[PDB]
Symmetry: C2
Subunit: 83 residues, 2 copies
């Protein structure tokens, strides 16, 4: 029936990041997720990256439907390591 547990080996995993209405709200971005043996050892990033994304910047202000377009830079995580 029950199988043994397997460590969440530490690598790049997909995460859903909501932006701070927009469209697209949230967006998919990489991030180190995972565990290290010696509990004191910690799993963190060894190379990050920047990818700016264009965003529809809707502007529903004073009875003025006047949307815009912003740019929001994302932080990806290209390759992690426990340390």
């Amino acid at each position: 029936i029950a199988e043994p547990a397997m460590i969440a080996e530490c690598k790049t995993r997909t995460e859903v990041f909501e932006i701070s209405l927009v469209w697209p709200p949230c967006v998919e971005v990489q991030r180190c997720s995972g565990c290290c043996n010696n509990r004191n050892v910690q799993c963190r990033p060894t190379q990050v990256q920047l990818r700016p994304v264009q965003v529809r910047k809707i502007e529903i202000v004073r009875k003025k439907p006047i949307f815009k377009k912003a740019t929001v830079t994302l932080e990806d995580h290209l390759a992690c390591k426990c340390e």
Copy 2:
């Protein structure tokens, strides 16, 4: 091409284990994440599956460590469909 939405489906996540070191400190389980069109349309599970797993509950005793076996029970998310929710 600018930013596009994160389809609402299921992507794996790591989930920490809460008790006495308990190896594995954390397993990957599958969870429902993503977005929708309205502010009150949420990416929610449509079927979950309840899977048990074995963990070694290491307790150090007197001058020696024991390797107690134990079954935590995880919850996998198998489906997902943007749902209607006053929210």
